[PDB]
Design an enzyme around this catalytic site. Structure first.
Site, PDB file in Angstrom:
ATOM      1  N   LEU A  13       0.799  -1.223   0.000  1.00  0.00           N
ATOM      2  CA  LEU A  13       0.000   0.000   0.000  1.00  0.00           C
ATOM      3  C   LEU A  13       0.837   1.280   0.000  1.00  0.00           C
ATOM      4  CD1 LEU A  13      -2.940  -0.940   2.369  1.00  0.00           C
ATOM      5  CD2 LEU A  13      -2.554  -1.437  -0.043  1.00  0.00           C
ATOM      6  N   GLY A  14       1.944   1.281   0.737  1.00  0.00           N
ATOM      7  CA  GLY A  14       2.776   2.471   0.793  1.00  0.00           C
ATOM      8  C   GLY A  14       3.901   2.399   1.808  1.00  0.00           C
ATOM      9  N   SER A  15       4.500   3.549   2.103  1.00  0.00           N
ATOM     10  CA  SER A  15       5.570   3.630   3.094  1.00  0.00           C
ATOM     11  C   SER A  15       5.299   4.724   4.126  1.00  0.00           C
ATOM     12  CB  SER A  15       6.908   3.899   2.404  1.00  0.00           C
ATOM     13  OG  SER A  15       7.952   4.024   3.354  1.00  0.00           O
ATOM     14  N   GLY A  73       8.548   1.161   8.380  1.00  0.00           N
ATOM     15  CA  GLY A  73       7.407   1.594   7.592  1.00  0.00           C
ATOM     16  C   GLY A  73       7.228   0.788   6.317  1.00  0.00           C
ATOM     17  N   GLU A  74       6.009   0.301   6.098  1.00  0.00           N
ATOM     18  CA  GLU A  74       5.672  -0.510   4.930  1.00  0.00           C
ATOM     19  C   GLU A  74       4.334  -1.185   5.203  1.00  0.00           C
ATOM     20  OE1 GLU A  74       9.015  -1.080   3.309  1.00  0.00           O
ATOM     21  OE2 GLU A  74       8.161  -1.569   1.341  1.00  0.00           O
ATOM     22  N   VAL A  75       3.324  -0.867   4.398  1.00  0.00           N
ATOM     23  CA  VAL A  75       1.963  -1.296   4.702  1.00  0.00           C
ATOM     24  C   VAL A  75       1.381  -2.194   3.629  1.00  0.00           C
ATOM     25  CG1 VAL A  75      -0.392  -0.583   5.202  1.00  0.00           C
ATOM     26  CG2 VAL A  75       1.523   0.830   5.978  1.00  0.00           C
ATOM     27  N   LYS A 133       1.422  -3.533   9.213  1.00  0.00           N
ATOM     28  CA  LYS A 133       2.496  -2.565   9.372  1.00  0.00           C
ATOM     29  C   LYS A 133       3.784  -3.312   9.711  1.00  0.00           C
ATOM     30  CE  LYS A 133       3.270   1.959  11.438  1.00  0.00           C
ATOM     31  NZ  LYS A 133       2.718   3.021  12.328  1.00  0.00           N
ATOM     32  N   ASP A 144      -1.313  14.669  17.664  1.00  0.00           N
ATOM     33  CA  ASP A 144      -1.117  14.693  16.213  1.00  0.00           C
ATOM     34  C   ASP A 144      -2.422  14.411  15.475  1.00  0.00           C
ATOM     35  OD1 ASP A 144       0.573  15.157  14.027  1.00  0.00           O
ATOM     36  OD2 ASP A 144       1.176  13.061  13.850  1.00  0.00           O
ATOM     37  N   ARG A 169      -4.960  13.046   7.972  1.00  0.00           N
ATOM     38  CA  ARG A 169      -3.995  12.070   7.451  1.00  0.00           C
ATOM     39  C   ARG A 169      -3.811  10.910   8.438  1.00  0.00           C
ATOM     40  NH1 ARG A 169      -0.212  15.154  10.628  1.00  0.00           N
ATOM     41  NH2 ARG A 169      -0.340  17.101   9.423  1.00  0.00           N
ATOM     42  N   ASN A 170      -4.199  11.131   9.694  1.00  0.00           N
ATOM     43  CA  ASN A 170      -3.992  10.149  10.755  1.00  0.00           C
ATOM     44  C   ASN A 170      -5.241   9.365  11.122  1.00  0.00           C
ATOM     45  OD1 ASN A 170      -1.284  10.720  11.059  1.00  0.00           O
ATOM     46  ND2 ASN A 170      -1.629  12.259  12.645  1.00  0.00           N
ATOM     47  N   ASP A 189      -3.411   6.433  13.656  1.00  0.00           N
ATOM     48  CA  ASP A 189      -1.977   6.433  13.897  1.00  0.00           C
ATOM     49  C   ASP A 189      -1.697   7.134  15.216  1.00  0.00           C
ATOM     50  OD1 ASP A 189       0.741   7.848  13.886  1.00  0.00           O
ATOM     51  OD2 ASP A 189       0.969   6.472  12.187  1.00  0.00           O
TER      52      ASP A 189
HETATM   53  C1  LIG Z   1      -0.749   1.953   9.277  1.00  0.00           C
HETATM   54  C2  LIG Z   1      -1.694   2.289   8.103  1.00  0.00           C
HETATM   55  O1  LIG Z   1      -2.812   1.307   8.165  1.00  0.00           O
HETATM   56  C3  LIG Z   1      -3.841   1.202   7.217  1.00  0.00           C
HETATM   57  C4  LIG Z   1      -3.757   1.737   5.891  1.00  0.00           C
HETATM   58  C5  LIG Z   1      -4.813   1.594   4.950  1.00  0.00           C
HETATM   59  C6  LIG Z   1      -4.649   2.194   3.569  1.00  0.00           C
HETATM   60  C7  LIG Z   1      -5.409   1.955   2.342  1.00  0.00           C
HETATM   61  N1  LIG Z   1      -4.908   2.693   1.402  1.00  0.00           N
HETATM   62  N2  LIG Z   1      -3.915   3.376   1.879  1.00  0.00           N
HETATM   63  C8  LIG Z   1      -3.088   4.335   1.115  1.00  0.00           C
HETATM   64  C9  LIG Z   1      -2.941   3.906  -0.362  1.00  0.00           C
HETATM   65  C10 LIG Z   1      -2.062   4.946  -1.098  1.00  0.00           C
HETATM   66  N3  LIG Z   1      -2.612   6.332  -0.986  1.00  0.00           N
HETATM   67  C11 LIG Z   1      -2.843   6.759   0.425  1.00  0.00           C
HETATM   68  C12 LIG Z   1      -3.710   5.754   1.218  1.00  0.00           C
HETATM   69  C13 LIG Z   1      -3.693   3.123   3.213  1.00  0.00           C
HETATM   70  C14 LIG Z   1      -5.972   0.883   5.386  1.00  0.00           C
HETATM   71  N4  LIG Z   1      -6.095   0.350   6.647  1.00  0.00           N
HETATM   72  C15 LIG Z   1      -5.061   0.508   7.530  1.00  0.00           C
HETATM   73  N5  LIG Z   1      -5.231  -0.061   8.809  1.00  0.00           N
HETATM   74  C16 LIG Z   1      -2.140   3.807   8.168  1.00  0.00           C
HETATM   75  C17 LIG Z   1      -1.900   4.687   7.032  1.00  0.00           C
HETATM   76 CL1  LIG Z   1      -1.136   4.168   5.569  1.00  0.00          CL
HETATM   77  C18 LIG Z   1      -2.296   6.059   7.084  1.00  0.00           C
HETATM   78  C19 LIG Z   1      -2.924   6.592   8.232  1.00  0.00           C
HETATM   79  C20 LIG Z   1      -3.174   5.769   9.361  1.00  0.00           C
HETATM   80  F1  LIG Z   1      -3.771   6.310  10.438  1.00  0.00           F
HETATM   81  C21 LIG Z   1      -2.793   4.383   9.348  1.00  0.00           C
HETATM   82 CL2  LIG Z   1      -3.150   3.465  10.792  1.00  0.00          CL
END
Ligand SMILES: C[C@@H](Oc1cc(-c2cnn(C3CCNCC3)c2)cnc1N)c1c(Cl)ccc(F)c1Cl
Length: 281
Positions: A18-20, A21-23, A44, A143, A147-148, A166
């Site tokens: 999904l992105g970057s 840490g590394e999801v 994560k 924070d 975005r969080n 986050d």
């Molecule tokens: C750690 C990560 O976890 C998740 C990410 C995502 C997710 C889906 N898509 N994306 C990104 C894809 C690329 N563009 C931005 C969003 C992130 C879904 N569920 C999650 N539990 C995360 C992210 Cl990546 C961003 C904000 C957060 F509060 C958290 Cl907790």
């Protein structure tokens, strides 16, 4: 004795990055029970070859969220800690982060936003319920920002929920300059009252569909502007009750800021008021 939810690594299956840490997106056989099946999750990962203070932050986060149980707080479902990379297993939020979800809503069709005022108010109510929880648990987030936060669905039609997501900077109290109270910026002081300042910036982000706070001001200039006693401009066509709430969140003096109970009260009262107003037209 504080136990992290150990989850069998071989039961976890990673898939999409999904992105970057590394999801990663992935599935996890039976986390939500025995007939749970292979539920979808986010993962994560802590670097193979990272700083050791990264691993410490990694663990401290993992421990912090073990503590929480609330509808508007992201669930940490499992951990894979005995091997590297460590995995933190989080419930999947298919809408991605709040800020992206909001901006896509704004930019899809100039027929108009994919999120209406009532959608946006419900978002605010959700996050506010979560801040009330964090405060009841004597935690300061430090924070708060779209975005969080994470949204549960990718689409704009299905029932949705937002959760604070986050907690990398949260602390127990028992840049991002655009979101920081003036105290925090001058004196490095953070409190539950500074959390209210950032929440006010947060619902401003929601009500503008993810605009940049203080667009007119460079990072350097921001503290100048706030110093002036200057504040954000109202979102376009923002309801007056909601503008009053935000403005009150950014009282230059911390003790004149409302409380999260009050903030949630205000939000539901407005929502009630607005709903009634439409139905008796
Ligand atoms: C750690 C990560 O976890 C998740 C990410 C995502 C997710 C889906 N898509 N994306 C990104 C894809 C690329 N563009 C931005 C969003 C992130 C879904 N569920 C999650 N539990 C995360 C992210 Cl990546 C961003 C904000 C957060 F509060 C958290 Cl907790």
């Amino acid at each position: 004795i504080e136990n992290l939810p150990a989850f069998p690594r071989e039961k976890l299956t990673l898939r999409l990055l999904l992105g970057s840490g590394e999801v990663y997106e992935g599935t996890a056989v039976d986390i939500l029970g025995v007939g749970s099946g292979e539920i979808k999750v986010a993962v994560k990962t802590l670097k193979k070859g990272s700083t050791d203070q990264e691993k410490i932050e990694f663990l401290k986060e993992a421990h912090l969220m073990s503590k929480f149980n609330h509808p508007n707080i992201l669930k940490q479902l499992g951990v894979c800690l005995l091997n590297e990379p460590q995995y933190i297993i989080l419930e999947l939020m298919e809408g991605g982060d709040l800020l992206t979800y909001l901006r896509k809503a704004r930019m899809a069709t100039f027929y108009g936003p994919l999120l209406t005022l009532v959608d946006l108010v419900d978002l605010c109510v959700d996050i506010s319920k979560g801040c009330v929880y964090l405060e009841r648990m004597h935690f300061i987030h430090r924070d708060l920002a779209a975005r969080n936060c994470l949204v549960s669905v990718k689409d704009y039609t299905s029932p949705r929920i937002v959760k604070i997501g986050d907690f990398g900077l949260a602390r127990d109290i028992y840049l991002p300059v655009r979101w920081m109270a003036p105290e925090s910026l001058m004196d490095g002081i953070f409190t539950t009252q500074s959390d209210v300042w950032s929440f006010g910036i947060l619902i401003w982000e929601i009500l503008t569909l993810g605009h940049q706070p203080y667009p007119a001001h460079s990072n350097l200039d921001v503290l100048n502007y706030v110093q002036t006693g200057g504040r954000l401009e109202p979102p376009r066509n923002c309801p007056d009750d909601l503008w009053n709430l935000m403005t009150q969140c950014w009282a230059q003096e911390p003790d004149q800021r409302p409380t999260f109970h009050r903030i949630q009260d205000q939000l539901q009262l407005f929502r009630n008021f607005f709903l009634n107003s439409i139905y008796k037209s």
